[PDB]
Amino acid sequence: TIKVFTTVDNTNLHTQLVDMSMTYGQQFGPTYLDGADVTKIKPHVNHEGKTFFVLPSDDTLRSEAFEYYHTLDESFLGRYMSALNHTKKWKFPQVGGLTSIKWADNNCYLSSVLLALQQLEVKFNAPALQEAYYRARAGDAANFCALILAYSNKTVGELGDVRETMTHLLQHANLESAKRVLNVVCKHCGQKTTTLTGVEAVMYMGTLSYDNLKTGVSIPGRDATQYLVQQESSFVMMSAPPAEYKLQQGTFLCANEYTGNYQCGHYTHITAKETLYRIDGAHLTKMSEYKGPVTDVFYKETSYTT
């Protein structure tokens, strides 16, 4: 018999003295060693002292997994481990001063997600994401990418949408202080006011222009427009179907270009430092001008009132 450690939250290590006659599955249920499914393998002698990931089998483990991941999906833990076995073989090079992801398994949309996050003043509620994000910013992003796939209920190799991915992640970001309030104008609504809090206070679908939200957008049974009267957030994400759109330095924080069609496309990240950057995985292109099909644009924000 050997002494190992089981854990669900990478934080609390539960000492376990394991019988060498039963498999790991017999003793804790499905078990993992650095991503490897060790459920149906007898414990080797050199496995002593190592730590293994297990699913919550009791209520203390269920408490630790909930406080660490802020989820109750038990398939979450399973899917997280399954994704990790792939993402720890991805490459995370520094591109444009930021951590990118080398092309693999249709990861382009995930790369655009990771690049924009590194430039937004945002931090997560769930300790799992916040701790994995701190390592992602340092180039060790395998755990963070696997968590994103797990939180989004996506698998390695699946084509993705950047906006949908951000909406799932920002559910665990501290947007408690984010508030957006709009004045809707119809000819018989009086002065009607719409207030958004949370993920919907910093996200919008319809146009890539933050100025158009301040200028006035239309809303879908009769004619009605809507303009922003107050914004309180560290950033705003403007989204729209892929439209040809020019990006000017100093007028935006970052953006995603989407080439291709509705069925199959290619995401590409765009930023600006001394000049405009085009970050496509491990690839980088510098440019004085950009004009192309953009789906999401990020803007720096602090306080805005009309």
Swiss-Prot record:
The active site is at residues 108, 266, 280. This is Papain-like protease nsp3. The hydrophobic region HD1 probably mediates the membrane association of the replication complex. Changing residue 260 to V: In strain: Isolate BJ02. It comes from Severe acute respiratory syndrome coronavirus (SARS-CoV). Zn(2+) 4 binds at residues 186, 189. It catalyses: Thiol-dependent hydrolysis of ester, thioester, amide, peptide and isopeptide bonds formed by the C-terminal Gly of ubiquitin (a 76-residue protein attached to proteins as an intracellular targeting signal). Responsible for the cleavages located at the N-terminus of the replicase polyprotein. In addition, PL-PRO possesses a deubiquitinating/deISGylating activity and processes both 'Lys-48'- and 'Lys-63'-linked polyubiquitin chains from cellular substrates. Plays a role in host membrane rearrangement that leads to creation of cytoplasmic double-membrane vesicles (DMV) necessary for viral replication. Nsp3, nsp4 and nsp6 together are sufficient to form DMV. Signal peptide: none annotated. Residues 1-54 form the Ubiquitin-like domain. A zinc finger (C4-type) spans 186-220. Residues 68-306 form the Peptidase C16 domain. It is a multi-pass membrane protein. Its cofactor is Zn(2+). It is found in: Host membrane; Host cytoplasm.
